[PDB]
């Protein structure tokens, strides 16, 4: 329902649970460039990805060729730095969400450009260690499919 | 802040990928044998994974022992038998939500003992596959914790 954006996306697993996160949700997925492994790559050809699931993806160059092509009507961002939770804002159609890579944040040059309002964090307890890329990924995704009623789902 | 069960993952990865949610969230988890790996396998302790986030873990030989030593006051099944979906459910202190193998589902033997309001389902779009353990296991903490206010998260 939303769009999703991998910024500089690194592991070729994560991605590949991603697409499949994406097609189950109906999340329309975006890829910004470089990613750490070409599209044709095996470790995620092989993940045992369904082809189906591609191509309702689209990459993007550059993070500004992304603004100029996709022009989201609010972009918010996945940040250990953000304050207000994953769960605390209120989606809305025409948003999309931003994730950093696997191994850093997003780039404080993009966050800085941002209110702090769309800059959201999943929570942890004290002490905790970086959560897998596709399990804050598919956190979010589901607590947005949630909040906007889960259009598009159905049974067995 | 509640307990999580993994009726005999397979996967040693996916399992450490669930070891570190249950630690960043302060949920209890449990594993009910047999596991498809040996709890000293390699591809989950060199995972990345610190010990501290192990030891909180328990092990339990059949699932009848898991009734007998924690005696849940409500046990929830991930299915994809289920009808109400994963945040269409009132959790509360003293839930047990169990998963799946990665391959397969809980048995019908088991499921056959529950009431319907118990067995829970991450909503899918039309024809959609498999979603992976961790990935399932992420999204319905975080959303059981959402429920809960995420009672024992801090910031950075």
């Given at each position: 329902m939303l769009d999703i954006v991998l910024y500089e996306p690194e592991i070729?697993?994560?991605?590949?649970?991603?697409?499949?996160?994406?097609?189950?949700?109906?999340?329309?997925?975006?890829?910004?460039?470089?990613?750490?492994?070409?599209?044709?790559?095996?470790?995620?050809?092989?993940?045992?990805?369904?082809?189906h699931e591609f191509a309702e993806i689209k990459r993007h160059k550059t993070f500004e060729a992304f603004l100029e092509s996709e022009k989201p009507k609010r972009l918010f961002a996945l940040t250990t730095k953000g304050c207000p939770a994953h769960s605390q804002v209120k989606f809305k159609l025409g948003d999309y969400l931003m994730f950093g890579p696997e191994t850093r944040g997003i780039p404080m040059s993009i966050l800085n450009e941002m209110p702090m309002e769309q800059?959201?964090?999943?929570?942890?307890?004290?002490?905790?260690?970086?959560?897998?890329?596709?399990?804050?990924?598919?956190?979010?995704?589901?607590?947005?499919?949630?909040?906007?009623?889960?259009?598009?789902?159905?049974n067995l």
């Amino acid at each position: 329902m939303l769009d999703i954006v991998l910024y500089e996306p690194e592991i070729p697993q994560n991605t590949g649970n991603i697409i499949r996160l994406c097609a189950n949700t109906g999340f329309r997925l975006h890829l910004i460039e470089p990613l750490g492994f070409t599209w044709d790559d095996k470790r995620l050809r092989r993940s045992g990805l369904d082809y189906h699931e591609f191509a309702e993806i689209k990459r993007h160059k550059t993070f500004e060729a992304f603004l100029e092509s996709e022009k989201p009507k609010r972009l918010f961002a996945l940040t250990t730095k953000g304050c207000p939770a994953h769960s605390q804002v209120k989606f809305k159609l025409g948003d999309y969400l931003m994730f950093g890579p696997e191994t850093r944040g997003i780039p404080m040059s993009i966050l800085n450009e941002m209110p702090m309002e769309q800059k959201i964090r999943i929570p942890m307890t004290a002490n905790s260690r970086s959560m897998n890329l596709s399990n804050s990924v598919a956190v979010t995704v589901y607590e947005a499919w949630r909040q906007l009623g889960y259009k598009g789902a159905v049974n067995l």
